[PDB]
């Protein structure tokens, strides 16, 4: 419940080395869940 | 489909008592390899409709569904299927042909996704059992992989 607060934060992976977790999650999860829905959950700007 | 189940039951009976790398198991693998394209077609039928049931319940697909009655037009169905990127163009065309769209080109996705589930369950399970049996009793056969 608390970790739900960092998903959309611009600095989610600050200490963890993998800085592309959001990209990875969106690519596997997005077709079945919706790319825009995943981008909103992870605070990603698809255009940029 | 029930007749296919009976035939697969006969094949499993032929496999009764089979040993690893048994002659009858190897002959059955040869028969399946000889029928490769048709076996592939049957497996693709089962896989396509299982994936259809999985997709129709997905949030992304339901986003393309908008009509109050819950019916999706053929064109919205095509758009939704393309987005999921799990079916090919010919596969989506075949699904549209099977969809049984009404006079207004509206598909009842729930009925379409549940139509072939119960009828194909017995033969599907028996095919899974046959493949598992053959795989476990003919371990090093790249053709069965």
Curated annotation (Swiss-Prot), chain A:
Reported phenotype of the disruption mutant: Perinatal lethality, due to severe defects in skeletal muscle development. Neonates do not breathe and do not move. Mutant mice show defects in muscle fiber development. Their muscles do not show a contractile response to electrical stimulation. In addition, mice display abnormal curvature of the spine, thin limbs, and an abnormal rib cage.
Residues reported to bind caffeine: 17
PTM (free text): Channel activity is modulated by phosphorylation. Activated by reversible S-nitrosylation. Repeated very high-level exercise increases S-nitrosylation.
Subcellular location(s) per record: Sarcoplasmic reticulum membrane
Tissues of expression: Detected in muscle and myotubes (at protein level). Ubiquitous. Detected in diaphragm, skeletal muscle, esophagus, spleen, submaxillary gland, adrenal gland, cerebellum, brain and in testis germ cells.
Domain notes: The calcium release channel activity resides in the C-terminal region while the remaining part of the protein constitutes the 'foot' structure spanning the junctional gap between the sarcoplasmic reticulum (SR) and the T-tubule. Pore opening is mediated via the cytoplasmic calcium-binding domains that mediate a small rotation of the channel-forming transmembrane regions that then leads to channel opening.
Family to which this protein belongs: Belongs to the ryanodine receptor (TC 1.A.3.1) family. RYR1 subfamily.
Functional description taken from the UniProt entry: Cytosolic calcium-activated calcium channel that mediates the release of Ca(2+) from the sarcoplasmic reticulum into the cytosol and thereby plays a key role in triggering muscle contraction following depolarization of T-tubules. Repeated very high-level exercise increases the open probability of the channel and leads to Ca(2+) leaking into the cytoplasm. Can also mediate the release of Ca(2+) from intracellular stores in neurons, and may thereby promote prolonged Ca(2+) signaling in the brain. Required for normal embryonic development of muscle fibers and skeletal muscle.
Subunit comment: Homotetramer. Can also form heterotetramers with RYR2. Identified in a complex composed of RYR1, PDE4D, PKA, FKBP1A and protein phosphatase 1 (PP1). Repeated very high-level exercise decreases interaction with PDE4D and protein phosphatase 1 (PP1). Interacts with CALM; CALM with bound calcium inhibits the RYR1 channel activity. Interacts with S100A1. Interacts with FKBP1A; this stabilizes the closed conformation of the channel. Interacts with CACNA1S; interaction with CACNA1S is important for activation of the RYR1 channel. Interacts with CACNB1.
Descriptive protein name: Ryanodine receptor 1
Originating species: Mus musculus
Gene transcribed to yield this protein: Ryr1
UniProtKB/Swiss-Prot annotation, chain B:
Tissue-by-tissue expression: Detected in muscle and myotubes (at protein level). Ubiquitous. Detected in diaphragm, skeletal muscle, esophagus, spleen, submaxillary gland, adrenal gland, cerebellum, brain and in testis germ cells.
Ranges for domain EF-hand: 59-87
Annotated localization: Sarcoplasmic reticulum membrane
Modification after translation, per record: Channel activity is modulated by phosphorylation.
Knockout or disruption consequences: Perinatal lethality, due to severe defects in skeletal muscle development. Neonates do not breathe and do not move. Mutant mice show defects in muscle fiber development. Their muscles do not show a contractile response to electrical stimulation. In addition, mice display abnormal curvature of the spine, thin limbs, and an abnormal rib cage.
Top-level taxon of the source organism: Eukaryota
Family, as annotated: Belongs to the ryanodine receptor (TC 1.A.3.1) family. RYR1 subfamily.
Known role: Cytosolic calcium-activated calcium channel that mediates the release of Ca(2+) from the sarcoplasmic reticulum into the cytosol and thereby plays a key role in triggering muscle contraction following depolarization of T-tubules. Repeated very high-level exercise increases the open probability of the channel and leads to Ca(2+) leaking into the cytoplasm. Can also mediate the release of Ca(2+) from intracellular stores in neurons, and may thereby promote prolonged Ca(2+) signaling in the brain. Required for normal embryonic development of muscle fibers and skeletal muscle.
Domain notes: The calcium release channel activity resides in the C-terminal region while the remaining part of the protein constitutes the 'foot' structure spanning the junctional gap between the sarcoplasmic reticulum (SR) and the T-tubule. Pore opening is mediated via the cytoplasmic calcium-binding domains that mediate a small rotation of the channel-forming transmembrane regions that then leads to channel opening.
Quaternary structure, from the entry: Homotetramer. Can also form heterotetramers with RYR2. Identified in a complex composed of RYR1, PDE4D, PKA, FKBP1A and protein phosphatase 1 (PP1). Repeated very high-level exercise decreases interaction with PDE4D and protein phosphatase 1 (PP1). Interacts with CALM; CALM with bound calcium inhibits the RYR1 channel activity. Interacts with S100A1. Interacts with FKBP1A; this stabilizes the closed conformation of the channel. Interacts with CACNA1S; interaction with CACNA1S is important for activation of the RYR1 channel. Interacts with CACNB1.
Listed name of the protein: Ryanodine receptor 1
Annotated source species: Mus musculus (Mouse)
